[model samples]
Target: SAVSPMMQQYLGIKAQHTDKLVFYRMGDFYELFLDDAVEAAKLLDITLTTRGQMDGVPIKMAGVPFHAAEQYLARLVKLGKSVAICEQVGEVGAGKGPVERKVVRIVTPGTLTDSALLEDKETNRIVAVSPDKKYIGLAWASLQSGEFKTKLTTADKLNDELARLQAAEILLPDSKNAPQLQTASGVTRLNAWQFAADAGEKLLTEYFGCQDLRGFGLDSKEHAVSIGAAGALLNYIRLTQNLMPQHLDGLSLETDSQYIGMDAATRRNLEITQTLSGKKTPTLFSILDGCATHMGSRLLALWLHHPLRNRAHIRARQEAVTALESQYEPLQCHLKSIADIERIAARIAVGNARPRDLASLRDSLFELAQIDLSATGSSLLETLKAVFPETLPVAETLKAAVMPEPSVWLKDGNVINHGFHPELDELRRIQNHGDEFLLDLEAKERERTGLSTLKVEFNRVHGFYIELSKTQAEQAPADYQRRQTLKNAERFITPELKAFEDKVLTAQDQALALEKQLFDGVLKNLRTALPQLQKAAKAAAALDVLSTFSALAKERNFVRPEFADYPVVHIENGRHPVVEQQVRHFTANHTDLDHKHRLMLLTGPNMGGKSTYMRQVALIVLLAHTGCFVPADAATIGPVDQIFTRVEMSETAYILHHATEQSIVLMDEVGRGTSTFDGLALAHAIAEHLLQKNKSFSLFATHYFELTYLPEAHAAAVNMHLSALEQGRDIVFLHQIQPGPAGKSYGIAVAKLAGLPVRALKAAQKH
Candidate 1:
């Protein structure tokens, strides 16, 4: 089959974007041809039809409204599609038979930075992973933000680290000599050569214009693996965006010991970000996320995902959260008045900013300049006060340049203020605001007419006209041209006025063009303050997150936990955050757990409350370490390195081996999946393993009554049961944990200590 000249151009561009859907530009709509059209038709839910024929075959065609293209692209990217947005770079038929067209942007799941396409409260990340056997190199960056981080972790921790990141898309080295991505989806394979150390060194060195990677925390050749990952990620982002993602200002190395490690299982089980059933609601994040701004929400997620192991860092955030408690509501309202300047600055850096992005940024920076930290006594809060005044001039520059309320897009014009530039002001005066002539004509018309009823004015439809009462219409001059007649006035245009109106009409397009040139110049100047704008955005987000913590702590009655140096976790009346909200009457439980009494062997016939109780203890630990107040009347956490929750139990063998002395393990009915004896035997061994071998502070829930006597053997373990009351042979679960075990699922036997005979009492006491 043969192709037309227009089709030939399309095919050439299509070949370059063979894997992605090409949203080809053609007038008001983005037109797609052939298989790209067919695929888009099915994915975008549009009707597929034919336009022109290629020899014997009809070329398939599809179209979507270009103005509403962001909505369609958001859907496609969410459903796993990358799109090349081809735009008409020049006027139609300006040069040749066809218009000059090019793909201006590529929108993918991770690479989408447009305000319309992104989630306001979450981060969209693209991750690159490289593994050379034992050590795994990890790098994650966001085009919508200024976050670029890398880490060199062990092979075993790769899955957990990847899970915590929860990236929108993952990039991996090609399978030729690379490990398969075991835990992540939406993965794109980069060329194997791109993951080479030498190539990484060259690309990184040139991009940052540095002799070595020492400045970015990649101090020596020892961290070359992570540098390779960082370099590969930058390369992939550049390829997708067709420009260097300069908002990624620097690279940070996340060391293994910097934060506590939670595996994928623990994250899901604790419902840190999403519930076990994979919904966001009723999760820990949903409960705690009362942030006024999107920046705070994204930062809150990172803090929760990787709670600090460093006590100083934890205490810093904790003290800040407390300091903000007094005026949190007023401060949160102040924050809400500000926009997402973090993402706005990033878009400006990428040259993807809308007129509104800059306008809102201008307004946000103005408000940011006025924030008062004098009411708070925090080191962090006092530090942020200095940033506001220092960055106030950046806002002043933008306020002087950009309009308080600008158009949505650049094409709508009036983006720059009148006095911002002389030429733009001159152009605007000539096109839309010719006030000198219009104002003088009003006085001249009134004096000439002598009736004092004639007035000079301009209506959009009638342009410039002179109006007088219709009762005096008969006295009009021959030089005046008649126009629209209002209720009591006859409108007329003079010869000189008509000539002036024509000049204004012809200068509009040129005026708009000049306005953009001035705006572009302003943008170029604003780039000098990029580092400052980015810094202010960061401090604002931190204050916002701290403010959110302060609000939730007050509203939910969340008490700050006391942290101890030794291994111990003590709580007085702890409650589950998500559970307590849904269940009307939730019994707050007490946990007096420690290194000496680390393992609580909970035995009960009824199952309901014990599971909730076990989960509550784990959540309290998670909240305390996340620099949040625990949902407890009083609590103390020793800051464990890892939190293990295996309420759903494979789990027996895992807890047996993985639970270290520093781990906080929460388990429920550990070996209930297998046969009776097998279940009891495995449960007994796993409990003993926690007591003697692993020796971690753990909470174990089980139904094996016979195994309750193991406390006699193990000093580190103790017995507790879910108390239930007998009502006419009907069961009523107390939903509370009490000392000792329930006897044989019968209420009388448990109360038999006073009722037993003297001989039976002696035998029972002897036993």
Candidate 2:
């Protein structure tokens, strides 16, 4: 009967969240019951036992210390298991029933905000979308930085948007024919109530705690779907983290016109974030990123994901990067010492900051204050320079209040500094001078009684005592009270020493309590100035990225890209950013395209360099759009609305419909999935459609000689080829792009060169 009420409480909550394992709190331990206990035992390798009989069956249970729960939860979250942390919130009832308990938060892989559960360089994101038959409204939020943003994308383009976002978790409404997000680590389907715009707008109002959604760029009636997506994210945030955070402030709308659209295939083939082999290294980001801080790297990642379409924005960022090039090493050295101020501000805003988080922020703030960028000749740099006020009190205050090296947890205590607080010092003296008081008592007793072996000591068994030999025991003062006796010694206590012992323990307790309270007050003080601190945090990160790009440009000979008024992409000699690192001797190629020569039909031997040339040209254009210098001697990029690369998946249908006038379409062996005759016909048709209808800037690479004839008919299509030299019996691959169709397919020569079966190569050649 005693277990009935407690089990009932757990079961009630468990029923609602049957999908997740509940970590029910029981004082110092987080206990798992029934099947959850069994699963936890299997995964964590912890001991399991039966706790009590409930509903005519034994209740099996497993437990972990509350302090160590994060480590265990991290393992589970990584394994894609959801855990609901059910904590006790109130005192026990008069009837001796279970205390009030509820799920405080759900620690999912995507929704993790705990410092111990996250990695330093990577950003954690969760996305929720309100979808329609044609277009979808998507909003993604990161708990680590409290960054929330939304975009209105089409159904066809959602995969590309999601690919670049790389969300750890995705939320979709439980409706028929929902779009599959294969890339996300986990997908959660929500009820219709959570996905509706009416419920979302009302819930948003509750959290904004204001009259209307005025400043968030989501107040208009036309953007109702966007508001709904935002609302879904807010509802989930509330459910997982009970508190409404002040730091989830910005909801930037990423308009279609703001960024150059790139398809998923283009992102992957170019290896912008990750390489083709699934390795994280040797990608565009890996090659370009030399950032000194977390925020800078993440910002650069976002910039690479959605490159700016506006010339003004790109030029502004480019100007800052150029002006800061000479001062990179110095600025980097200073930035390297700074902490992730953006994330720290988020933690502080949510009142979840650790003692070390505050300590680092203090040192980072000191670094920020020392930066002097007034001499920079760019508007971006000058504005960022002013963000660092000479007398930044937030940094000074954090330095004054926090210890030099504070403990990770506030419960460990000793977080406050000496001379910082009068009351704390007053109690600290009592705890500090405790041993000195006992030594003074020993001297006074020794002189007054002339005892040979008299000493004062304290321990748990006895509060405090004066020790003496049996022969000198009789000389003890009458004021002393004998506490313990031994075979050849005696121990006694004095009123003064007893009072001091009581004061010492009391002071220790009071001092710790005061330190915790003061630390909280310090956090509150910082929260009040959060607006300025957050502003400085963003500027510091922006400056950090600018300095990083500047260093890259100077060291790698990267030149600032020039913008064009009409359709044109002219590169003097552009090198592949990632490929050049591994290749001992890389050939710098030229990419010349204009309104007249919008499409380049490339034909070459299999190993000749058609793919590499096409990819290098695309990479240059991509880097230019991000406002970073290109890997070229001289570069000029035209206005590109979107980039589409069709490497697979009958994608011919999707690309044909989506390619527009200002799009850059890259197709390599496009029709190779079919027979030779069919492939050639489809390639010819695709080329004609692109040249006549789409009029997109195209780079077409194929082994089909027939497709090269398109340039003869259409002025927009130009024939290009990668050349190879035939030397004796072997074909020497020059890997150079030239103007014309290839001399031969050279498939047999390449196969032989790669050490293919000699019999098969000869057979193919004879055929």
Candidate 3:
């Protein structure tokens, strides 16, 4: 039978990826067959129909459009489902009549790449690691965040974070370590594989299409060695599982074990993003804007992953923002320069040439941005290039405009203005005429058309031309310029302009010669002031993120709010900028974080809003230090060094993963994936990391109640239950952020609200 060959291949693939639906592409749609089709149809709300008879049974199938596939994939991923895409290899319609089809990519919840499909301020990461007993090679990345961190994390606390990530279906190297991959809470296990350094790098290289690993900060040789260690704990699902993995595009490694020796899991658990928590919010953007473009985002990611060695230096930046925003006048003025020119450049790119004084304006602006705003023009240029791919052009234009000069003595002990240029007058003259010509062209054309009395047509392509009724054209004077014939308005040409137009055409080439004598000297003088400017801008931006971070932190009381014996309290009217943007559709819940109630155990049904609540607490803490307005009614707060999150899972392959053994844990939905008893037991032990040892206030959300009992075991641990009130059998999800664990999950209540059948609602009520 014709189906025999495909049938055998399909069966082989099905056996290999039994856990995930196989999306075999046939043209634009990726088809799912047999059992995979049934599951996909149910999840995607698509048709489940038989394609053809296979062996003796009918082959059920379903399909999805390629362009729209990402939305469907995102839905499945958010629901904790793994998806794989098998694309055809080689030419189908080309020389080869038919092409070979192969599984090219596997998509997971943790490994996402599309920026439009992701939160602007959030990271979309994909990670893979081997969970072997001998050694573990771990990889975690998000293209949106430009973070691709791979390490040889020990199979210890670092392994725990990786374990948590794995539950979310991050690709694993192999599954042999599954049995041995032990974890406390917020952990995941993996299968095993034999260690192979070259092979591991080969795998990643094949995926990303790169020659050397240096671009990503991982030495190809060293990475292969680590990957060999990682591969030993085999669970290579990139090929076997539902492999619709988003590629790690433009991601690079900026830091190594060089700065901090924290493992993937430990950093994740500790929730360290920037030198300052909130610093990541804006500093990341500022550091890369107009600097690296695609590469810049990755570079910023690397920098964040590896903070500067001197912690106090970072703190000094925090103080700088304080002084700039409140205490220092010069700094404040300079901060505006950094923020404004970038804004101005964006305007310029859009073809807004109206500012006749733009050359002078941009000159002064670049001067400030270089000397008074950013300080180190080269560094600022780098960051700017990272953010704006067209930064080179911007730099070139601004250099000419500002006149790159030195700020020092010239001939005779004179403090020379390096920017002083005789060509400036010609430039300014051309600038004025350019503006004048544009305006006159618009005004005269309307009058010349004769139908000017009427509200006529306007079109850019016609270049200041007008449309007229035939009757009006006939009535016009014989010399009436038919601008449409020449593809422009007659009013645009004047004898005064024709002569100058010829000169202006070659102005740019002529201008280049004048650059050194005219602009360099001025820029030279201006260049000296750059360092002071950068210090000021960093402070301003850091202040913006921290103020908001701290206010929210204090309001939420993320980490006890108070330090030592003092009371930690922040009022309402606080907010989280990134959080507000992420959870924008939902009505934000409000509350206060005070000393009496330092910690709040938030609980709600799955997808009902627990993770968001927890993140809100952490964001608030970050906002306060950054010095920005909190995303709440009001806010007040104390300082905090650490803002740890234990919500997301860790995907390390190492078996001996622990939270307390390493640091703090942001345990989200602890023990929700497996056996209740074991999950609960592990959750309880991990709770001791924060509860018993240091008694630091933590925001922990979990499905298991075993840890809640810890309050009974230890007096420091307190419990609060989040509750949903019911009217009759009907239920409503408040979608409200509040304090405490819930007496009930209220999932049934939510299902009913979602318009589930009455019987299902009753079952939910009964369950």
Candidate 4:
């Protein structure tokens, strides 16, 4: 059998994007063929039918409508499937055979920029790694918001760094290290040549339109390996998207010193981003993020994930928060009115914006114009004020040109204002005039023939006509020639009416075309001012996040913390920020750590709030250094180099072995993952090392009361326990941390409270 024109075109395109499920565009629907059809039908639960013969056998096919493609794309991508979006490149009739269709973009799990498919409060980064002689370079980009950054890391800390990024896709050279990146959702391997140092430098220079990497703070030779990773990432994006990602304006080189390193185990055990069950509601981020704008929410997550290590930077952010706190109401109102300008700017840069997107941009710009930050004294606020434009001329132009609530699609027309363009106005006038002209023509015909019931009407088969009853038709003027015979009426047409009908029909189509042209011009103008627009957007997002932090502080009764250069964390009455909100009444605890008292050995019975208290201290220190107000009565925090946690089931041997002097370590039931005796021995040894050898601030929580003797053994170690009270026959947990070891383990009392049978409880108590 001869190959069909459409199938041949699909085959050629499918050959290129073999890694992706091809969504071949047909009229009104995107069709999948053969293997794509077989898989998509099963995965998407859509109908799988047969098309014409391919090599004498029936071709399998499945399709989804163009209007609902994004939903399907999101589902497929989430299921770890990449899809190639093939679109008709030219007009249907302008093609020699079938309309020339080509793959415009490939949608992958990591490379998704679609707002619907992505979470507003989190970042979606695509990472690429390049191994060097001394260090490995990791380059990542959040394509939706145009955040591109690279980090230089050692092999020992590579997995920790990757865990910190939480990237959706990881690219590796097709060598020995390819299998190492299998943890990321999409681990793609490419040729080594794509990551050549010289090629990377050339790509970077061309992308940022600069002669060197000095402007982005990347040292040429120092960051050469990272630059190569960045270049390979860009090359892959271009190959998949078939278009340059122009919104990626700059790249920053990040080092391990920039953030307090939290390894994968620590993050998971702390439940900082999500809980053990993969829930977000009880996470620290979910508790604190009250941001109005999506961009602000995302920025807050970024700040939380990568806490600033620089004191000056942290102080600047805190000052901004303080300034926002003073005038939180008005600022919050203005922020609520703003749109997702970062995504809008990105869409504009890529020329993917619709009429509604431009309108949203205009509204957001107008909101920014209303924001008044002159009363603030913070340097960060001052910088924001300076960068934010007082007046946006292009935004005003868009406001005047586009409709307030334009359709999401540009082809839907009626998007342009009536007076925006002369030609569009004239075309609309002609179309509108046709309505009134027919009214007058009907009245004139009725008066000329003395038949008041004569009416002018139109249908697809007949252009326009005057209709009257059969009795009145015979009395009509000779100029009205019979056109159609109806049941009880006679339809007639005039030469003048026919001419007007032709003009009105042509005017409607021309008006739609002209409106599109005018809307495209508006987008082009906005595209030109994208840089200024992006700056304003980023400033607004920063302002929103600062204000949100301030509001949360005020509402939660949190206080500003004082930072020092030494290793000490003192809090008068610190509460767990996430837990305090969950429970009606939460007990506040105090933490006192200095050079002499660095390690605290906490011993308490199960369900005595030991874990919660320790996590509270860690979270308070983390939040304080992140420049947010701490959930405490008073807090005095010092520089913490890194945060390490060894909770249930996670390996602690490695973390204890590598614990640095500046590290803040939290160990809960440290040796519970092994035998009781071994666990107790390891816990005691780890505590002695931290107290006697290392100058680290550590919180060790354990049920093994033997470890509490460390305070007696080492001068730097302190013993703390949760106090419990006995009321009547039942023991009640006080959930208070005091300077002592727990008097006794209340296992029998806990068992009784758990409704164990009296016989079983007695038997356990006797033992």
Candidate 5:
């Protein structure tokens, strides 16, 4: 046995994409052959079977229908498998041999543009890293949402930046010595030629349709490496998608200087956006997210990841938040009515939009037209207001053309309005009254043929025909053409009957085709306004986030913080936002720090409020920088350049050495990972280093009571603890942070509460 021509073609295509599963299109099902079948069957949980043998070997096969491919593709991509969607390119059953087929698109975890496979509130990112001797260039994009950003960083900060992004997939130059990225598990290596700087400039210029990249804020000379990395990402997308993604409209240059930087360790330890177990409920973002739309929620997440460092930027956001706080109810009401406009626009750009997508887009624009934010008086709000339209004519047009609620697919007609087009209406009318038209034709044919016994009938093979009795068949007119013969009667087609049949049968098809054309025309026009609509979407999302902050502030009784030039943080009656919400009747604490007392060495037993106090302070400062009112009665904070929370002892040396004077360090049991002597000395040294610098606002929580004497060694260092109440043999945790150090560890009392054996406890106490 020899390989068939079809199998040969499949093998050739598979050779080019050995790493991906080839979804070979066969009439109604997408089939996989040989080893591809075995692998896909196990992953997709489909049955594996065998096909015709080749060279004495049975070809293994498995398949999923084309209609349900999205779910299968999503599953495969999620399992870290790429899929090449091969589709038939030629007419079915028309060719003498096999039909022409080709791979149209490759689906991967990072390149997913289909709405069904994506998360509405989260971004899907594809990142590329270009490493050089001096600096590393990083570029990432969310193709579905049109978010493209580039960063240039030193090798020392590469890991930190990579951890911050949390990209779904990473692209690197195909070399053994490529830069290592531990955070990126889904990595794809592209040819080094794709990352050439000059080639990148060419690609960017062509893709953006610009002579120079200055319009996109990319200086080709200075940002050559970053531009190249971005170019590589675009090229990879084009190759995999088999088409250029139109949603990636522009590139943005980002820098760590603009935002307060938090290393991976800090983010994990603080659980800023997610808990240690990856749960979002108890996180800071979960508490503050009052967004009503997916775009607003995503924007809120971006803000959480990139808190502003510039005092002016932070203040502007605060101003906007303050104005929205007064009009919270109405603002929320208006925002909740809006739809996810950005994703809608993205779907349209990729030509994957359905009638429902258009409906959503139209509805969102209409909601935008109704919102009134002009009186906010904040510069940011005013700018956002300037972008909104008084009336969206496009939305009105869509409302009149499309049905109120269209089906997901246009193939299921009735999407267009009844009176949208004259021809479509006429075709529809003919199709609706098809029975009446047939009856009228029968009457005309009987009268013309002069045969009383003549009758009109219909069948599947030959649509409509006239039947005459055997005796009257000879008397039929020559104009009546014979169609088929029967035992008692003979079937004939008149010129009039054929015309009627054509009109009745083809009416629906013509109507459906015309409707599709009209819908496509609407989409084509919608594409032209993509830039304007995206701008409005950004403004709407920003407004929604601001409204959320205002709502949270008003509900939680949070107050605005005053910013000073000096390195000092003062909060009176501050409560842990998440903890307070979880535990009723929670105790509120006060924080007072100045240059004279910038570092606080906190000591307390396990389960005390030490960790909560440290975390609450960090959260308050972060909330302030994000332009939201802190969870405090009154607060004043100086600008913080960076934030580092060291929960693990392994990160102690790094935090103490790398943190700048303008940074904020939250050290919880800073030296607990080591022996007692080493841990105490390390914790004390960390306190001394931060206080001697007098630039950082540090919180050091530890079990070492000896380190509490730091207030004597350095005037700028203060001692604090979460005190416990003694109740007989039991110890009750007050869960409150106060001035002074803990007197004892209370190990025996905690052990007793833990249900330790009484004899064992007594033996330990006696010893």
Candidate 6:
């Protein structure tokens, strides 16, 4: 009876985790039983065993340590599995009572904690879209931003606006009997409203107790859209928590993009991360990393946040950056100064400065010594000091002295003429000494080389260097050794030449060290100042871009972009910023996910575009909501929000399954990689869940459809099937996303794709 009771508890635990392979925590280790044992043994990289026989059948068991769960969880999640971490809630190791466990957190693809699961340079986005009565509401929030906004749409357009907006907190009627919604059944309820153009800002301000919605800086003219969307969000909150979101503070308007300029399909085809192509390399993150500094990253992020509407706006900023790169000497000079400082700081970080390194830092100081302290070098020197605090303060002090306006010597009524400040007098003496030293060295080098016509050039980059003409070099004393050769010029070296060269080279090296210093300190300062300037530029450009794009959209509304015939394989002008720059050989293809297809049951093995195509449809719908130009060559489109996707579980798959007449049906694929029959069974049930739970627009892709019987059972629920077509054979797959389910799985077709032997292909084909 105790055993049966434990079995019942196990079954209950299994039910909650559903498709996830639940690592049932018994004590110090997570235990698995029966088939779960075999699966867990493989996944945990451990051994499996058998327990006492039950009903003449031995029960298999396996386990892994509790602390090692994260390692296993990461692997499972990477393989596209959801893991429900069931932790012991009470009474463990005391031996006084039975251990109690509860599912504390469900780890899904969208919920990742490990840095490995995330892009370091990007803010992970958690997007939730709810389809309301006549409108779709979308709420996207990111941890980095700490802000969430709402958008509502019926069948119109979507855009992130920046001008004015409407927002409010409201009470909803407790009853939900008014209408039958098109969203998933569990989606609670939504509050809805109609907003006037100007009333948008007033409503949001009044509700949130803010005068200007401009603080949020999301400008939009779509007052009706914002108001409706916000109301729907409120409704969802009310339904889910039975109250408003406690963390949901006041609302602020932001200029958000509605419809994307590129369509969903095109975005994927081009491999842009945001477009759901599932390709990671050709992402904005890659481009930002290639930049010389964080300034580019910040600027790139800003542009992404506020996408340009007109080509002019985009080109203008591009030109500005190009100009900055090509000719701004002061900026580059300052950059070199800062960078040199960073190098010194880096050297200091490892250990105490070696005498040679200290000499290096000092030489850099002497070169900067000539720079007017009051003018530019002081600010740079301060920045350098922040990173390399160990740097000797001679440059900083010298800079500070020179920073003040030059002072005049004067005679007082009771005193004879005198020099201003004793310190200045001392500095002048030192300056003279340094200059005389430099002149004496130059004179010696000239005599040693027998070239009085030698010209020396000094700047931030070259530091101190001597230039010699062809005749000057040829006439030099035979004792002088040739150090450098160039067109119409040559450099000769003598003992004095070597000494001067060392000084100049040392000065150059110090400049490099200063550049490093500047990067770590002053560069960040420059980045901070960018937003105000960027925003001012963007605001002026927004008006122009919006006007031009709106006009183009209006005039070319009838000129549809090239497109594909299948609903699943959608494409348009999908421009991936990162991909375009990285993979130049591949030309982007323009095609539409044809509307003729209402349903596409895509089938392919892992890593195919099955999931991508599903998302492409969803993105197209999302982009349409934003009202930005579809990332298409051109387009005609519709808006959709009630988008749902169900993939077979690789975790907690046991909970949502129920026994059925022909086969055991799973709510979602449970034990996805663990067992064939069980994962298939769970996948069947998840398909059922979607059919029974929501009438919203949905995309579901799975291996369970491989089962022949279920499709006949749910004909209306399952429509046109799509598949990767076979190449000249009964079951050769093309690996492309397309319409309809394949007649057969093409396992061997994969070999052909990988350029398998013709004999093997021919034999397989014959078979």
Residue-level lDDT of model 2, residues 1-767, one tens digit each, is 64677788899889988888899988899999999999999988899998889767888999999889999999888777889989776442222565567787788887766668877667789899888767778889887777788887787567777887888888888766455655556777777678777877788777666656667777656667777888898888777765556677577777877788776777888888888899888888888788999889988887888888887888898989889777888888888988888888877765567888888888888878887753465887888877677436687877788789877676566888888999898888864465576666666666586646555666678776666676666565564555565566765556666687777777777788788778878877744577777787778888888888888898887999998889898998798888889876888889888888888999877787778888888888888898789989999887888877764477666665443767477888887675888888888888877776755788888888766778778887889888888768877776777888767443464444446555556646743
For model 6, residues 1-767, the per-residue Cα lDDT tens digits are 43566666777888854546777777787777776778767765778898656566787888777677666766765454555566665442222466676665555443332334443343333333333355434444332222357544442222211101111111122333322222111122222332222444565565556666556543454334454344444333333221122223345443323312332223333333333544455454343233222232323343343333332333233333222232333332432332122223222322212233334334444543333321212232223223322223434432332223222211111011124234323323433534665677666656664545666555454334556776565555544554654567776444444465465444434433433333233223322332222222222222222222233333322122222222233445443333334445323333233233332334546544444444444443333332233334644433221222234333222212222111001111233575877667765555555443432223555565455344466553444344544455654333343444544343453454445465456646743
- lDDT to native, each model: 0.77, 0.78, 0.45, 0.78, 0.77, 0.40
The number of the candidate with the highest TM-score is 4
Superposing every Cα of model 2 onto the true structure, what RMSD results? 4.8
Q: Whose TM-score is higher: candidate 5's or candidate 6's?
A: 5
Whichever of 4 and 5 has more lDDT, that candidate is 4
lDDT of 5 by residue, 104-220 (tens): 778888877677787676678888988877677789988667888888877656767777887778888965445555556578778898887779889988988889888878897
Q: Considering lDDT, which of the candidate structures 1 and 2 is the better prediction for this target?
A: 2
Q: Write model 1 residue lDDT over 645-740, tens digit each, in one string.
A: 773347445554332656588877767665779888878777777776655677888877778887798777888877767675667775887888
Lowest lDDT block of 10, candidate 6: 409-418
Listed in order, each prediction's TM-score against the native is: 0.86, 0.87, 0.40, 0.90, 0.88, 0.32
Please say which candidate is ahead in lDDT: 1 or 6: 1
Per-residue lDDT of 469-538 in model 3, one digit per residue for the tens?
A: 4335443334444434532322221233334455654554345434434433433332233222223323
Off by over 4 Å in 3: 2-19, 26-29, 65-68, 87-98, 102-105, 115-122, 129-138, 150-168, 171-191, 194-310, 323-390, 393-767
Score candidate 4 by TM-score against the native: 0.90
TM-score of model 2 vs. true structure: 0.87
Residue 728 lDDT in candidate 6: 54
Overlapping backbone residue pairs in candidate 4 total 0
**Model 2 alpha-carbon miss at residue 366, Å:** 0.9
The list of candidate 5 runs beyond 4 A from truth reads 5-9, 12-16, 89-100, 179-182, 215-217, 241-243, 373-375, 441-498, 526-528, 647-649, 656-659, 693-695, 726-729, 744-767
